[PDB]
């Protein structure tokens, strides 16, 4: 039963778009419907964030903050200078000005959005020492995000998040395959990749890098430029953060806040082979991942990198072992759900038999009751005690 009235905020991964994009086909619901609308209809106030799908977690966090409380995106002077991109980005009206007045939110994140959510909490709570110092030494202005002391976030829920990275990035042809994946999702939305749509359709939001699809350019063409751009070749990217080494680095500073509840959901859509020990995609797996991605993930080992048999089970895009919470380079604690949701630790909700895209409804799965999944989750979030009392 309801203990809090915090609104829910939905957040996407390396693919994602606003409610008005993709001609209305939702990331959060896809072919199954509109998850936000369902929650809202059931009495759970819910909103959706849209940030750069290919941008670093940092960039996304800055975008999220500003999208939340309003204003112009501020990536941090130190950060901007270090990576060679703009300091300021786009301007937002603010979905929830209530945040600057004591309110709190629950964040439900998918895929890489889980890393973003964590980072946001971290920055909100602790700010950035580096940014503070840079401001002081150079006399530049400083975003409140980097000051610390903000407590918006009551909880963070992650679904199919590569907390420890994903070995998908180790594919020799990762670059091409990754963009083919973006092409696949466009396909799911009935959007062609070889057509120069004059309407935006899918805004990658690369204002900091000064990149945008030009007139006369199709997605295929656009992706070819992107592949050669700083959003693909620099360390300040989703590409990097998505890697095992990158996730590890992020984990070294992005810690669980003791004042926030964390829930983790893992996904899998594979079966083990008895002779090989490898994992193979199940029947029903989205066509975007079944042919090349899943098999790679289910067979890729790397001793020096620390990738062993535990990493093989996957949901087609991410290794299931990476989803229960940050482990590599992390001090965070992870406890298996036992009926009690604990604060300031990762409550491992278990593993669900659904693939990376099925879980958000981008790919169909009649056996998966998506509406009930999200409503059950929402119910659980609403039951969280903003202050738990200590007892026997
Ligand atoms: Ca399916
Ligand atoms: Zn950046």
Q: What is the CATH number of the domain that holds 351?
A: 3.40.50.1820
Say if 190 falls within a structural domain. yes
Q: Are 6 and 108 in contact (CB under 8 A)?
A: no
Please tell me the distance from the alpha carbon of residue 72 to that of residue 66, in angstroms, as a whole number.
6
Please tell me the distance from the alpha carbon of residue 38 to that of residue 32, in angstroms, as a whole number.
11
- Name the region of 365 (left: φ>0; alpha: ψ -120 to 50; beta: rest): beta
Say if 162 falls within a structural domain. yes
Considering the candidates 55, 111, 143, 155, report the single residue annotated as catalytic. Answer: 111
DSSP assignment of 311-372: G--BSSSSBGGGSSS--TT----EEE-SS-PPBTSEEEEEEES--TTGGGTSS--TTS-HHH
**Ligand nearest, relative to CA of residue 363:** 1
Q: Spell out a b/e string for 4-43, using b for 16 or more CB atoms within 10 Å of the CB, else e.
A: eebbbbbbbbbbbbbbebbeebbbbbbbbebbbebbeeee
Say if 2 falls within a structural domain. no
Q: Are 51 and 64 in contact (CB under 8 A)?
A: yes
Token pair, residue 173, equals 């042809």
CA distances (Å), origin 272, targets 14, 81, 265, 321: 27, 47, 21, 15
284 is in an annotated binding site: yes
132 class by beta-carbon count within 10 Å (0-12 exposed, 13-18 middle, 19+ buried): middle
Query: What's the gap in Å between 340 CA and the centre of ligand 1?
Result: 32
Overall number of domains in the chain: 1
Say if 47 falls within a structural domain. yes
Say if 388 falls within a structural domain. no
Report the run of H or E that residue 222 belongs to, with start and end.
helix 219-227
Say if 389 falls within a structural domain. no
* Three-state DSSP class for residue 159: strand
164 is catalytic: no
* Three-state DSSP class for residue 281: strand
Whose structure tokens read 């940092």? 58
Query: What's the gap in Å between 379 CA and the centre of ligand 2?
Result: 36
**Structure letter (DSSP) for residue 190:** T
Q: Are 327 and 163 in contact (CB under 8 A)?
A: yes
Residues in CB range of 23: below 8 A, 6 or more apart: 189, 190, 191, 201
Cα angle for residues 269, 370, 34 (degrees, 5° grid): 125
111 is catalytic: yes
Report CA torsion sign: 199, 205, 210, 211.
Answer: negative
315 is catalytic: yes
Please tell me the distance from the alpha carbon of residue 127 to that of residue 84, in angstroms, as a whole number.
21
CA distances (Å), origin 139, targets 73, 84, 131, 134: 19, 19, 11, 8
Please tell me the distance from the alpha carbon of residue 195 to that of residue 109, in angstroms, as a whole number.
31
CB atoms within 10 A of CB 220: 16
Please tell me the distance from the alpha carbon of residue 51 to that of residue 186, in angstroms, as a whole number.
17
Query: What's the gap in Å between 318 CA and the centre of ligand 1?
Result: 16
59 is in an annotated binding site: yes
Query: What's the gap in Å between 165 CA and the centre of ligand 2?
Result: 19
387 is in an annotated binding site: no
Cα angle for residues 106, 110, 112 (degrees, 5° grid): 115
Please tell me the distance from the alpha carbon of residue 340 to that of residue 261, in angstroms, as a whole number.
11
358 is in an annotated binding site: yes
Please tell me the distance from the alpha carbon of residue 378 to that of residue 43, in angstroms, as a whole number.
10
Residues in CB range of 295: below 8 A, 6 or more apart: 278, 280, 281
Query: What's the gap in Å between 360 CA and the centre of ligand 1?
Result: 11
CB atoms within 10 A of CB 176: 13
206 class by beta-carbon count within 10 Å (0-12 exposed, 13-18 middle, 19+ buried): buried
Give the technique used to solve this structure. Answer: X-ray
The residue count of the chain comes to 392
Resolution in A: 1.9
Say if 296 falls within a structural domain. yes
Say if 40 falls within a structural domain. yes
364 is in an annotated binding site: yes
Q: Are 122 and 257 in contact (CB under 8 A)?
A: yes
Considering the candidates 34, 241, 315, 348, report the single residue annotated as catalytic. Answer: 315
E-strand spans in the chain? 8-11, 46-48, 71-74, 88-92, 105-110, 153-159, 261-267, 270-272, 279-281, 334-336, 346-352
Helices 219-227, 174-188: crossing angle, 10 deg rounding: 150
Whose structure tokens read 């700083």? 230
Provide the domain limits for residue 334. 8-383
Please tell me the distance from the alpha carbon of residue 367 to that of residue 358, in angstroms, as a whole number.
10
Query: What's the gap in Å between 387 CA and the centre of ligand 2?
Result: 35
Please tell me the distance from the alpha carbon of residue 324 to that of residue 161, in angstroms, as a whole number.
8
């Amino acid at each position: 039963s309801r203990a809090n009235d915090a609104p829910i905020v939905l957040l996407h991964g390396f693919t994602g778009w606003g409610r008005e994009e993709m001609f209305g086909f939702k990331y959060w619901g896809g072919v199954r419907g509109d998850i936000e609308q369902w929650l809202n209809d059931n009495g759970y106030r819910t909103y959706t964030l849209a940030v750069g799908p290919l941008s670093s977690n940092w960039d996304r966090a800055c975008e999220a903050y500003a999208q939340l409380v309003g204003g112009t995106v501020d990536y941090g002077a130190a950060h901007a200078a270090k990576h060679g991109h703009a300091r300021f980005g786009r301007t937002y009206p603010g979905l929830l000005p209530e945040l600057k007045r004591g309110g709190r939110i629950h964040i439900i994140a998918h895929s890489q959005g889980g890393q973003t959510a964590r980072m946001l909490v971290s920055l909100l709570e602790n700010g950035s020492q580096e940014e503070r110092e840079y401001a002081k030494a150079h006399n530049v202005s400083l975003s409140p995000l980097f000051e610390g002391g903000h407590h918006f976030v009551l909880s963070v829920t992650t679904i199919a998040t590569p907390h420890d990275g994903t070995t998908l990035v180790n594919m020799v042809d990762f670059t091409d395959r990754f963009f083919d994946l973006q092409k696949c999702v466009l396909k799911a939305a009935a959007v062609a990749s070889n057509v120069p749509y004059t309407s935006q359709v899918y805004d990658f939001k690369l204002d900091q890098w000064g990149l945008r699809r030009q007139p006369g350019e199709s997605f295929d063409q656009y992706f070819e430029r992107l592949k050669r751009s700083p959003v693909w070749t620099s360390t300040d990217t989703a590409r990097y953060d998505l890697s095992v080494p990158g996730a590890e680095k992020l984990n070294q500073w992005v810690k669980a806040s003791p004042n926030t509840y964390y829930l983790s959901f893992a996904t899998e859509r594979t079966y083990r082979g008895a002779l090989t020990g490898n994992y193979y995609p199940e029947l029903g797996m989205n066509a975007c991942s079944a042919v090349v991605c899943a098999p790679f993930l289910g067979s890729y080992r790397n001793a020096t990198l620390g990738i062993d048999d535990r990493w093989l089970e996957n949901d087609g895009i991410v290794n299931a072992f990476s989803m229960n919470g940050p482990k590599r380079g992390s001090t965070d604690r992870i406890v298996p759900y036992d009926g009690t949701i604990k604060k300031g630790v990762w409550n491992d909700m278990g593993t669900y038999n659904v693939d990376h895209l099925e879980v958000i409804g981008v790919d169909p799965n009649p056996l998966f009751d998506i509406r009930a999944f999200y409503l059950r989750l929402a119910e659980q979030l609403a039951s969280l005690q903003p202050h738990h009392h200590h007892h026997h």
